[PDB]
């Protein structure tokens with residue numbers, strides 16, 4: 001299989017870039033992020049032309065790339081969404097997991 005990609009996978013599709021890692025979400029199910037679409041599962045980029053490319057930000061619906069990265073009220077687990085569940089009420093983590101500034105995502 002293609003397995004997980006290398007590390008240092010960052011995405012600069014917005015004025016605020018982010019750096020993701022697969023060696024960190026190893027315990028996380030691939031289907032947890034790479035939600036199934038059409039019933040098929042594949043390893044593609046969220047910001048794929050035709051997937052999450054709304055560049056609206058202020059939309060929060062689905063196409064909102066910046067919505068599937070923060071918005072928690074989504075049909076699927078969101079970055080911050082899951083993070084919120086992970087960090088929960090542990091403090092510090094929610095500042096480096098769901099933190100707006102000075103976090104693991106945004107620095």
Ligand code: HEC
Pocket residue numbers: 011012013014015016017018047057066069070079080083096097098099100101103104105106
């Ligand atoms: C606190 C609730 C947060 C605020 C406010 C913002 N973020 Fe994030 N963020 C993350 C990713 C993966 C991206 C996309 C990277 C890319 O492709 O460019 C973003 C993007 C943004 C943006 C850009 C939208 C714009 O054009 O203004 C803004 C304004 C923004 N974020 C604000 C990832 C994460 C993340 C990882 C779990 C966290 C905790 C946050 N973002 C939290 C906030």
Ligand code: HEC
Pocket residue numbers: 002003004005009010011020022025026028029030031032033034043044045046047
């Ligand atoms: C969220 C916690 C994720 C989990 C769990 C896994 N992946 Fe992932 N992967 C994620 C993102 C956000 C991205 C793209 C970054 C973006 O800007 O959206 C990726 C990318 C990949 C890719 C690259 C796409 C390609 O060109 O093929 C591959 C191959 C990939 N991911 C594989 C993969 C595997 C094998 C996973 C389980 C072992 C897995 N991912 C989990 C987010 C997340």
Ligand code: HEC
Pocket residue numbers: 033034035037044045046047048050051052060061062063067068069071073074075076077078079
């Ligand atoms: C195209 C093949 C996609 C890729 C690659 C990813 N997503 Fe996606 N996602 C896609 C669609 C078409 C939809 C909505 C269904 C529709 O037709 O409208 C979604 C939805 C989400 C959601 C839910 C948002 C909500 O319900 O509020 C989330 C949280 C989400 N997607 C996240 C996400 C992540 C993290 C991805 C990379 C790991 C990713 N998506 C890739 C289409 C596609």
Ligand code: HEC
Pocket residue numbers: 018019020021023024025028032033069077078079080082083086097104105
């Ligand atoms: C649960 C389904 C998750 C989803 C969806 C996303 N992440 Fe995550 N993340 C998760 C856990 C359990 C942890 C461990 C906490 C730790 O910091 O060790 C993390 C951690 C991160 C980190 C920090 C660690 C690192 O790898 O540098 C970052 C920067 C991070 N996560 C980013 C991230 C992004 C951008 C996501 C959406 C594309 C995302 N995570 C999804 C659990 C889950």
